[PDB]
Write a protein that binds this ligand. Structure first.
Ligand SMILES: *[C@@H]1O[C@H](CO)[C@@H](O[C@@H]2O[C@H](CO)[C@@H](O[C@@H]3O[C@H](CO)[C@@H](O)[C@H](O)[C@@H]3O)[C@H](O)[C@H]2NC(C)=O)[C@H](O)[C@H]1NC(C)=O
Ligand SMILES: *[C@@H]1O[C@H](CO)[C@@H](O[C@@H]2O[C@H](CO)[C@@H](O[C@@H]3O[C@H](CO)[C@@H](O)[C@H](O)[C@@H]3O)[C@H](O)[C@H]2NC(C)=O)[C@H](O)[C@H]1NC(C)=O
Ligand SMILES: *[C@@H]1O[C@H](CO)[C@@H](O[C@H]2O[C@H](CO)[C@@H](O[C@H]3O[C@H](CO)[C@@H](O)[C@H](O)[C@@H]3O)[C@H](O)[C@H]2NC(C)=O)[C@H](O)[C@H]1NC(C)=O
Ligand SMILES: *[C@@H]1O[C@H](CO[C@@H]2O[C@@H](C)[C@@H](O)[C@@H](O)[C@@H]2O)[C@@H](O[C@H]2O[C@H](CO)[C@@H](O)[C@H](O)[C@H]2NC(C)=O)[C@H](O)[C@H]1NC(C)=O
Ligand SMILES: *[C@H]1O[C@H](CO[C@@H]2O[C@@H](C)[C@@H](O)[C@@H](O)[C@@H]2O)[C@@H](O[C@@H]2O[C@H](CO)[C@@H](O)[C@H](O)[C@H]2NC(C)=O)[C@H](O)[C@H]1NC(C)=O
Ligand SMILES: *[C@@H]1O[C@H](CO)[C@@H](O[C@@H]2O[C@H](CO)[C@@H](O)[C@H](O)[C@H]2NC(C)=O)[C@H](O)[C@H]1NC(C)=O
Ligand SMILES: *[C@@H]1O[C@H](CO)[C@@H](O[C@@H]2O[C@H](CO)[C@@H](O)[C@H](O)[C@H]2NC(C)=O)[C@H](O)[C@H]1NC(C)=O
Ligand SMILES: *[C@@H]1O[C@H](CO)[C@@H](O[C@@H]2O[C@H](CO)[C@@H](O)[C@H](O)[C@H]2NC(C)=O)[C@H](O)[C@H]1NC(C)=O
Ligand SMILES: *[C@H]1O[C@H](CO)[C@@H](O[C@@H]2O[C@H](CO)[C@@H](O)[C@H](O)[C@H]2NC(C)=O)[C@H](O)[C@H]1NC(C)=O
Ligand SMILES: *[C@H]1O[C@H](CO)[C@@H](O[C@H]2O[C@H](CO)[C@@H](O)[C@H](O)[C@H]2NC(C)=O)[C@H](O)[C@H]1NC(C)=O
Ligand SMILES: *[C@@H]1O[C@H](CO[C@@H]2O[C@@H](C)[C@@H](O)[C@@H](O)[C@@H]2O)[C@@H](O)[C@H](O)[C@H]1NC(C)=O
Ligand SMILES: *[C@@H]1O[C@H](CO)[C@@H](O)[C@H](O)[C@H]1NC(C)=O
Ligand SMILES: *P(=O)(OC(C)C)OC(C)C
Ligand SMILES: *P(=O)(OC(C)C)OC(C)C
Lengths: 728, 726
């Protein structure tokens, strides 16, 4: 008895992980979505009490894809007719429901096919984007006010980011920021007039007689980038003029001088907004702190409040310039910047004082700032046990930085080593999210003493099911190379016999600041591979990886497709050395950046891997977007770094692919890593006459995540691997 | 015993079939482009002379891929900067060499990116199309006369065809026709304005940062087709001070009622031209015989003088209505039409008499009329031995239809059963081209007494090489499916022993009027599969087959994806029961239409086939072009045949692929059978949960014939086939 974790078990999602999605509406309560009905909870005692139930919205017809309640709690936006676009972007229909009269507002409805809706942070004002133009609703039922008239499809964006700004810059779609109070409405405008369009076919259902051509403004390496502008309009003046004027906030000169980006915008106070800019050469960054001049009605940014942040050994921040966390009065803020020893830590900034004051240690980094009160500052880091693959919640005392307390480390050191967190409105309560190494564990706490209130979810059910199946184990250790340690991860098969020689599959990503070796508990393809197929699925964070200091993260600066690739190969060598690895059966696979590395490795001529699989890989850095690529590669010009752009392609290694079994896969409708990238790979292989396996996924994007598609690829991928290892 | 015919041999083309392409310049001489230079031959004796060392242009500065001599023998049109477009179309730069002065003409040269060029039929005039407009030069060095001014890229085509007219109705890019002595220049105009555009990506060289979107006006089943017009312009009456006047020939009235096509144009005399129109529902066809009117300047197509060609069982013609062959005085003509019983034979017409008279009859078909003189009518049919997969040159006496003589049947019955022919201007001499069952044989003959003058190329070189290798054999036989007999062929391994069992691959195409079973000698992939891998490669012509009468051909009318596919399973099912076939190792593959039938068969649930390979297949008929599809399917409308359109798709059979090993191959830049076709097959198989093998070829067209992609696709297929069998 006691079966194993089968492929179907994975694909069919038999053994599911329970979550506990919260949503703090106040500082004492939160909303819990239970599919059918959505009730509210009292953090204090844990009172149930339904806020809105299933039937409360029946006889409606359209299935409510999502909700969103106004701050003042009088209205509720109903999101239906949802139509996903990119990662965060999506078009949809909206209806507002009045809770003070249990009536569905029917006048002046929000336009169908609206791109984005935002409640004001206070009250019940609305701001939305339709046809790339911003509109404002002072009252949910009254007609709205047009804010911009320049909106133009694929050309001018107001209130919404373009493709690149959504995925790489703001890692979000919304390009508008309501002032804390709700008086001002700040927004960015993107001009993509000059930006080249990526075009690819989209077949749709058989019913479509003619394929469609999807064309999106997408700037590739060194191409023409969109331009940006920032505006701030006063919504209180809307009911007084007819056409409120949007004040523009320009400069800095050090930015206007050349190609630049808008990377951050966060309000500090009712009349103070901070803005961060970045040159296309992401080695320099400028933060302006602007105040509203009640006299001129203009926004001013004193140079005495301008903070610069440049990097010499690489780029600024992990993926973008750090984020500002202002204190209440808005006269100072906290930011995560690498110290002199190249480690990312928190330091205190005085808006008019240029030098910050670090408040955190050394060898280890702070992952992010979670909450800031008058008392303490809550942050998550990997300081505990010195393991960079772990994550915990610490609390540092603002009046004595020598007083730092870990709030999650000892809650359950065995089962919980990787934490996430969510504080209530004023940080009176917080929910902890343990995701490993044991089964997820959700708990609620009160900030006063950090006393555990109760267990919201312990996945007890799942624990009972998994003890009936031969689950694999996971070793998280490190290996020392060139007098410096690099962590690796290994999903070991049931009853691991260090005497036997197992076949090994190297799971790889290796991108800048990435981390494949951690304490997170997972139920993925690797689980099945080790549990059923008895294959060791190992991952290694070599040079280029992050969370271990710049010295390591910046190793591949201006040099992608090198050390990151080399270390990956060496990890295997180091693994076989351990003696429980069958050298004749060593594979490697990755997705996107992983596909890139997997492919660069398979073409190294090393002779360490027998076969490999590349999914939606990158072939040459000139085919990827500007913001990400240039951040590490610089410019594809002979004056900058063109030389390395051409030396790091996968096509240039085509000839060496004759020594390994290769499997190429990619979705034909991938807006991120274009099908073009794999198209050039196959073509090069055909030119040097190298036989390989190929698989394309009609109309699948980068995720190739559609239910059927997802099941189809892992199934195909599996036959490949079993065949390469001589299984079953 | 010697070595076998390996996959490399085929891919590297180590064994080549010598050819002998000649081009008659008169009734007594022909040109033969030898290695470097071009020579002229006197058919009478065999002696020849040089015409130009080719080295004459060693310092032309450009590479030349073609040399076109004026019928005059006075000028040479040199073609360079060749850039291929579709099957026939392409653009190029041109230059003219004046032989009278042995010098390149420099003044008023032809525009770069020219789309087409053609000498007058007799002297040295020129009609070329540039930027979709027509131009005419009366003399190589003189200015060009602008014939048309309406040309427009992807919208209006003057003198040139659009994608569909190029591939499905004229099998050519040229859309202009000179009159016999070159006085008149007839041309068609295509308006593709409302025609939808197929769009796909072309990634080009690694260097291109952004993929380019190729887009071409292509009418799929039932979409808006291009409209067409016909004009005739007089080249002897055009000034450089006045725009040319092109008279338009309209009608027929029976054709303007709905959508129609211009499917044929053939001059009858210096002032008589014939036109054949075909309704969008390729059931009805009308031929006009328009005459020029001196004192009017118009062209009159007298009714009563027009002939109608219709069918009640299918479409007209094998692929389109046959070409007319007018007599000397152009008062009567001969043309191949279908019998009362459905067999194609030569009918004798009179431009005024409605009914014609069949001059040939029987249960076999005339493949095509090759030459006509006052004495005889030379044609090619599959009468001999009664096997439809054979071809011979026959001639019938025009004064006594009882006196017909085969001119090729007995020359070499063992080696030659499939002939081609090429007569000289006045059919004084003719070149017979034998293509099987043995090595190609090229010979010359004189019509006066059908004497065999001399051997041109007997392929003696290649013969000696082959006997040093174990070559497979070919069995051309038949089986009887309830009353009717259908022919098949079998590529058998070396030293075939019926006492042994062999794995079988069913090479299929099976589209309307096709023939995969014949006597032609081929040196393809199957050669290797049988010679090296000892695999029997069988082909079978079932319902829908051609050259065997209409009862067989029109059998799949309005019903594609039925009998031709089912008969493929039946043929294969009986093949297994032959004794030398390993019923456990039977595969099937096809290209294009062959891919569709392969896919339909694999998804029929027969269980007869173990694995199959589909190359650039058709998945659903609404995806293919109008002219071709609708010819057999009509329109995809519920009032018409929309139901079958929906019933004959590949994807609908997705769930049935769980019992077979499928390999889907397709070129991303296939402009003919769009990649979309296979992208829908792959998607359907993913929705049903069927795992399969796939292989796309970026930027490859329907042919997948680029040097590398070619060697690559056949290498991937071989691994698959032998993996499925071993
Ligand atoms: C988005 O950016 C584009 C530039 O990529 C801006 O377009 C440019 O707009 C200017 C006027 O503001 C145009 O110049 C003017 O052109 C007219 C007529 O062509 C001429 O009479 C004037 O003397 C002047 O030259 C310019 O053509 C145009 N350039 C391009 C490439 O489009 C556009 O204004 C920006 N949109 C927004 C909302 O800021
Ligand atoms: C609310 O106010 C804004 C800003 O005043 C208005 O937008 C501006 O409207 C003008 C007129 O349509 C736009 O066009 C301009 O036309 C002149 C004359 O042809 C030309 O010289 C300018 O270069 C410009 O093209 C102008 O671009 C536009 N400016 C902005 C920032 O949008 C808006 O129309 C007003 N809304 C209402 C309802 O009145
Ligand atoms: C090629 O074929 C075109 C039609 O397919 C010819 O055109 C004609 O048809 C158009 C419609 O496409 C007619 O209407 C146009 O003008 C009206 C304005 O009144 C618009 O509302 C409409 O949308 C069209 O744009 C045209 O009147 C008609 N003639 C012309 C000259 O356009 C086109 O002319 C033809 N070209 C050739 C060389 O034959
Ligand atoms: C091929 O030679 C032709 C001459 O052949 C000679 O005369 C025959 C009657 C016969 O005896 C044969 O054995 C001799 O070699 C020659 O044909 C004639 O016509 C051409 C027309 O261009 C003329 O130029 C030539 O002078 C004529 N010759 C004679 C003898 O009258 C022909 O030119 C030549 N063809 C080629 C392509 O070389
Ligand atoms: C057809 O074009 C070729 C190629 O030149 C192109 O067109 C030119 C106008 C210019 O835009 C180039 O960059 C293009 O590549 C013409 O080539 C000629 O070449 C000779 C030397 O070899 C040079 O002196 C000429 O200036 C070039 N152009 C012309 C018009 O002579 C070619 O001549 C063109 N043919 C015709 C009939 O115009
Ligand atoms: C021949 O016909 C063409 C086509 O109309 C004439 O060219 C046009 O002339 C007008 C008036 O000068 C221009 O507005 C057009 O742009 C020209 N081109 C086209 C396509 O219309 C040409 O002038 C005529 N020549 C003679 C001698 O009649
Ligand atoms: C080509 O054929 C045309 C048409 O028959 C000939 O042109 C006619 O010639 C006669 C006298 O020979 C004239 O009366 C007619 O007016 C001409 N018709 C036209 C439309 O021009 C022409 O002679 C022949 N060409 C040659 C070289 O013989
Ligand atoms: C060519 O085919 C058409 C239909 O594709 C025939 O026209 C009629 O079409 C209707 C459908 O609308 C059928 O029900 C009829 O049987 C068809 N015939 C008649 C007389 O109505 C048309 O007959 C065919 N052409 C010929 C010459 O038979
Ligand atoms: C919050 O919004 C603004 C933020 O400064 C508060 O202040 C008003 O700001 C406007 C700016 O347009 C000034 O014109 C007013 O004079 C300011 N009022 C005061 C009392 O200072 C505003 O008071 C707050 N509004 C609400 C509804 O709380
Ligand atoms: C940030 O990187 C840029 C990359 O362009 C560097 O800018 C260029 O100019 C410098 C002098 O001002 C040179 O020293 C750099 O070599 C040159 N960079 C390139 C790629 O050519 C800039 O120096 C860097 N600045 C910091 C503070 O690191
Ligand atoms: C939860 O109940 C609250 C009342 O508190 C009650 O009295 C205290 C002393 C405790 O005994 C507590 O357990 C009791 O519930 C309400 O004020 C509150 O609104 C309730 N919360 C919800 C969501 O209904
Ligand atoms: C939204 O679109 C639907 C579908 O066309 C329509 O029924 C409805 O009236 C629209 N509502 C608004 C406010 O436009
Ligand atoms: P991929 O790895 O895409 C993921 C970020 C989704 O692309 C590289 C360039 C990071
Ligand atoms: P394919 O078989 O194309 C051939 C003409 C090569 O397309 C079908 C529709 C006939």
């Amino acid at each position: 008895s006691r079966k194993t974790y089968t492929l179907t078990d994975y694909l069919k999602n038999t053994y599911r992980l329970k979550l506990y999605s919260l949503r703090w509406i106040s500082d004492h309560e939160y909303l819990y979505k239970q599919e059918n009905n959505i009730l509210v909870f009292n953090a204090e005692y844990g009172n149930s009490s339904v806020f809105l139930e299933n039937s409360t919205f029946d006889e409606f017809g359209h299935s409510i894809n999502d909700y969103s309640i106004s701050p003042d709690g009088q209205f509720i936006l109903l999101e239906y007719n949802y139509v996903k676009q990119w990662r965060h972007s999506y078009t949809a229909s909206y209806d507002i429901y009045d809770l003070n009269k249990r009536q569905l507002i029917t006048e002046e409805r929000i336009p169908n096919n609206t791109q984005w809706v935002t409640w004001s942070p206070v009250g019940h004002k609305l701001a939305y984007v339709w046809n790339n133009d911003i509109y404002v609703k002072i009252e949910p039922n009254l007609p709205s006010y047009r804010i911009t008239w320049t909106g133009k499809e694929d050309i001018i964006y107001n209130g919404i980011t373009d493709w690149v700004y959504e995925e790489e810059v703001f890692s979000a779609y919304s390009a508008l920021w309501w002032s804390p109070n709700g008086t001002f409405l700040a927004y960015a405008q993107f001009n993509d007039t000059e930006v080249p369009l990526i075009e690819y076919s989209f077949y749709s259902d058989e019913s479509l007689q003619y394929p469609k051509t999807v064309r999106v403004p997408y700037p590739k390496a060194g191409a023409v980038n969109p331009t940006v502008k920032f505006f701030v309009v006063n919504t209180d003046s809307l009911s007084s003029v007819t056409n409120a004027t949007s004040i523009q906030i320009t400069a800095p000169a050090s930015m206007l001088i050349g190609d630049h980006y808008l990377c951050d915008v966060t309000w500090a106070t009712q009349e103070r907004i901070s803005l961060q800019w970045l040159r296309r050469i992401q080695n320099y960054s400028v933060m302006d702190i602007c105040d509203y001049d009640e006299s001129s009605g203009r926004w001013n940014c004193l140079v005495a409040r301008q903070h610069i942040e440049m990097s010499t050994t690489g780029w600024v921040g992990r993926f973008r310039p750090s984020e500002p966390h202002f204190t209440l009065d808005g006269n100072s803020f906290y930011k995560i910047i690498s110290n002199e020893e190249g480690y990312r830590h928190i330091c205190y900034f005085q808006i008019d004082k240029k030098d910050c004051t670090f408040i955190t240690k050394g060898t280890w980094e702070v992952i992010g700032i979670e909450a800031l009160t008058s008392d303490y500052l809550y942050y998550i880091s990997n300081e505990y046990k010195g393991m960079p693959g772990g994550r915990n919640l610490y609390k540092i005392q603002l009046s004595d930085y020598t007083k730092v307390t870990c709030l999650s480390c000892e809650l359950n050191p065995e089962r919980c080593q990787y934490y996430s967190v969510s504080f209530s409105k004023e940080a009176k309560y917080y929910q902890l999210r343990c995701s490993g190494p044991g089964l997820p564990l959700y708990t609620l706490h009160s900030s006063v003493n950090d006393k555990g209130l109760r267990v919201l979810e312990d996945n007890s059910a799942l624990d009972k099911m998994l003890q009936n199946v031969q689950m694999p184990s996971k070793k998280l250790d490190f290996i020392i190379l060139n007098e410096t340690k690099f962590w690796y991860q290994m999903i070991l098969p049931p009853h691991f016999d260090k005497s036997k020689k197992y076949p090994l599959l190297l799971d790889v990503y290796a991108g800048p600041c990435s981390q494949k070796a951690d304490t997170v508990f997972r139920l993925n393809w690797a689980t099945y591979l080790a549990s059923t197929e008895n294959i060791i699925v190992a991952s290694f964070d070599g040079r280029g990886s992050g969370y271990q200091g710049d010295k390591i993260m910046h190793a591949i600066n201006r040099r992608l497709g090198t050390f990151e690739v080399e270390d990956q190969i060496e990890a295997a060598r180091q693994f076989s050395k351990m003696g429980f690895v069958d050298n004749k059966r060593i594979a490697i696979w990755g997705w996107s950046y992983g596909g890139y590395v997997t492919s660069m490795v398979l073409g190294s001529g090393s002779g360490v891997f027998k076969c490999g699989i590349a999914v939606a890989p990158v072939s040459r850095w000139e085919y990827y977007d500007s913001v990400y690529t240039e951040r590490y590669m610089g410019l594809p010009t002979p004056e900058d770094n063109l030389d390395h752009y051409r030396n790091s392609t996968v096509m240039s290694r085509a000839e060496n692919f004759k020594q390994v079994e290769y499997l190429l896969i990619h979705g034909t409708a991938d807006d991120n890593v274009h099908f073009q990238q794999s198209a050039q790979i196959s073509k090069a292989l055909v030119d040097v006459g190298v036989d390989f396996q190929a698989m394309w996924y009609t109309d699948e994007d980068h995720g190739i995540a559609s239910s059927t598609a997802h099941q189809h690829i892992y199934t195909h991928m599996s036959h490949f691997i079993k065949q390469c290892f001589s299984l079953p």
